Symmetry: D4
Subunit: 156 residues, 8 copies
């Protein structure tokens, strides 16, 4: 059923990660959302990453802040595309989050998006675009959505 | 023929972008490589982004340094996934490149990877992972590639 | 009619960009203000840049935050002077805005000003100074304006 | 004679500032180049700024690194457009230069360009664009220049 | 009469600069406080720096934020020690203020202190320490002040 | 036999990590050194962390650069003290390394040391200090070592 | 009695440092808490560091902000492991704190933790992990604590 | 005899600190130069700071890099003005040095100068200016020196 997995390290990250989920709902893309902590539930994170392909997921969106290792460790355990959303940390305003996620070494990519809510929104859209590369209907919806916002901004 | 488009603003960026192209070659994914400058050939960039889908491309890999606008402006003109590789700039060592690419606003995602050559490498792998979500053979090749490196590092 | 064009990616940027427009009003420089988004209305942005000179514009003031590409992409499409105002972003406080605007490569300059409201004010003054290089009346107005502030600051110099 | 003044705090900055001057030469815009130090020749800097308009200058390009105060202090003393080129400093790689120049307060704008040589090139182009807002011949030259580079980049687009 | 001159570019900087003035009051060092703007009253700033020595001043404390040029331009026009207090700017939290002040080139030193109120406090103490190098009574007062705080913190 | 485990993601990190090992040799503390990559050998990393205590290790020193997750992921899988050495990365000079290691969330500490070789040296010393809290002979050796350097710097 | 010493430069730091103390209470590890200022009570700091081992302390947790020298100066005066908590400063949000603590030179390590409260929590846990290397009961408690959180996050 | 003390943590800092000493030689101001390490010779540093006034020093110039605590700890032990020169560190290019020195808390000022050699030059000049506040001959020399450089730059 689910094509996209949206995961995060803590329930306090839900404030940020729900934007991604809104986009998936808006585009009618089935997904699952779960708390998976790289540091508090490491084994559970490995099991989630390992089984993702077998369970039918095509893309994983992972949100994390501070020493954000969730996206990269999930990426090291699955060859599904993994999208990393840097959550805005308290002290360093997501600078720590961003560098921990985007600077992955050769071999283990993480598709990194902007810090915060704009990034979460974009993670959902990027997941959609990934599916849209083979699901013509999802691609056509992204074009129509983008054409409506364009008309709205230009004429508003 | 070509599934992935690898573009960059200058021939000097090739030193960085070739790593992505080596990965595509290694995984037998057909691709095209071109110089497309957001600032020196803006119209051409739009024409390249507009037609990408019609031409058969499924993913675009774009590299740029400094005020790196190439990935983002291409992403605004196509709903294909766009992967942005921040090139290491002279003065700010790709920090400017990184922020200009990854901080895209809600509506226009760019899958951002590490600054420099590690990122270029990962851009090629990420493009493969995207294709691998629907091309099992490409996915199987990524798994085998990762398993060989694993064995190599652990036994080495 | 309009000599300056003041543009921005979103209505939320108006809070910042109105400072530039207050300056143009204060100096009686005709201008137009529009929402032009590099990412949400890319084609419209190109059309706005391309036609600027034909429409009579002499300078463009463009405000944007985050991955701020509006000033740079407008500058790549017109040879009118383009002034970029980095809008204070939420997470990185305009640092992302600043670098995305000022670090333009050889061939496509963008006259970059301070982050936020101070930069917006100065964008309006910089546009006026540009016009003032050939309009003596505008230049004289800038001198007078600056002389009044100087007197105002110096005669209110005692902290009491 | 001279329409643009290109100044810098030290001879060592010439390595960076000559890029602006190559552009002015290429476009046949008369200019003058001088060493004017905000910290080592402060009085001379004020004299140079004060008199710029009387001497016929229309734009000033000022390069400085570190605690780069030359562009800002020149801008506080003339209402001609002042373009600031952040010179790449040794320790902070121009980050100090950049912030010292771009973050000018309301009232005293400085048109800030990229750190280093790319910024220097663009300072020359920006000065030309400023003049080009009223000199159609200079504007036409900028359009032609930009059209030739475009063709040059696009026809050498195949990586081989 | 006045031994120290405390100046700043705007009345809004007073919130920060008063701490330095409280210290001078506390140590009975005569001082003057004025608004002197490097960018809005440049000529006046030069005149204030030029005449400082003739007028009897021994130290200048200058506060400024953003592109903070006041301390540095004053320092270039007088050979009195000049203490620069970086005011906390809105966007960059005084980072711009700090670099613009402290990075002065060889030939024109500015004694730079902490960003904000702690620095303002220290500017007053530093000015006293300078005077205390030749005024034993001022030095003795600094020692007693520091000894009282020490006792207060350790026993508190 | 081995009380300390010194690990790193790549052989290229050896240049930095040998400083820690030199200290352990100097102090005659038995240790093991291995390449363990969080991203290239994730499973092996888990196995290494899990079994550390059973194998007799008391402290783990882990070095990594860029998106440095090795120390943190090892720390999430063992309750032995884990010391993180940020390796100096090419583009961001270890700033990415530092933030990815030090900013661990509540529950999973990583004792972080300086970027580069100085940090590596200190990692070995810190591991010794930890052992020295219960091994009086190791503590006495650290004091004597520190006293000799003190005499050397002051008299040199 | 006390095995751990928790110190800080000012009572205002207490808000951050109590997190470490809560952990030590939770784990029933006896400790002492004191205000010890590197800059306001330097002599006292030296005395506290010097005598730590004689007084029976095994680990010292030190919190400081801004130009945070407390952890490092304490570390230069004792060969007990010293854990540095960077307190979130007002202007630079602990970046100054972090760099002033973590960047210790070869010879004088400071085990550095995250900026703020998360770091304080981890400082207490790290101190326990150090004691746990030789106190099996403390180690078992850390494992049980970590297992309960794991079950709580995964099932919650 | 000596009016100024020039100290540093390591002989490798001499490359930077000699510029300050050149200025003092050029201006004929007697001074002493010594290696004093805040971390390797902490007690010796306290003794040097404590006795500075009694020995006749009027100003102390202290150079240090990384976690640069030498200037601040010396400042906490003497009420003589203390000038801090941030040495350019390897990884963070003196950013660490700068923040560790300039962000001193209220009560313990450090007169901070630019990172590197320009700062060292300026430390010597600032010390001179401090003495020049009461030694008319030293002040007159600073004016003449500055007038010669002005003529040289303007006419050169």
């Amino acid at each position: 059923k689910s094509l996209v997995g949206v995961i995060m390290g803590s329930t306090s990250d839900w404030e940020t990660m729900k934007y991604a989920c809104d986009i998936l709902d808006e585009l009618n893309i089935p997904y699952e959302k779960k708390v998976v902590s790289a540091h508090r539930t490491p084994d559970y994170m490995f099991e989630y990453a390992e089984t993702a392909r077998e369970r039918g997921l095509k893309v994983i969106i992972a949100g994390a802040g501070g020493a954000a290792h969730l996206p990269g460790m999930v990426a090291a355990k699955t060859n599904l595309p993994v999208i990393g959303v840097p959550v805005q940390s308290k002290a360093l305003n997501g600078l720590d989050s961003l560098l921990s996620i985007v600077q992955m070494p050769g071999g283990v990519p993480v598709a990194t998006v902007a810090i915060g809510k704009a990034g979460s929104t974009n993670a959902g859209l990027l997941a959609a675009q990934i599916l849209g590369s083979f699901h013509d209907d999802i691609h056509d919806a992204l074009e129509l959505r983008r054409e409506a916002i364009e008309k709205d901004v230009r004429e508003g």
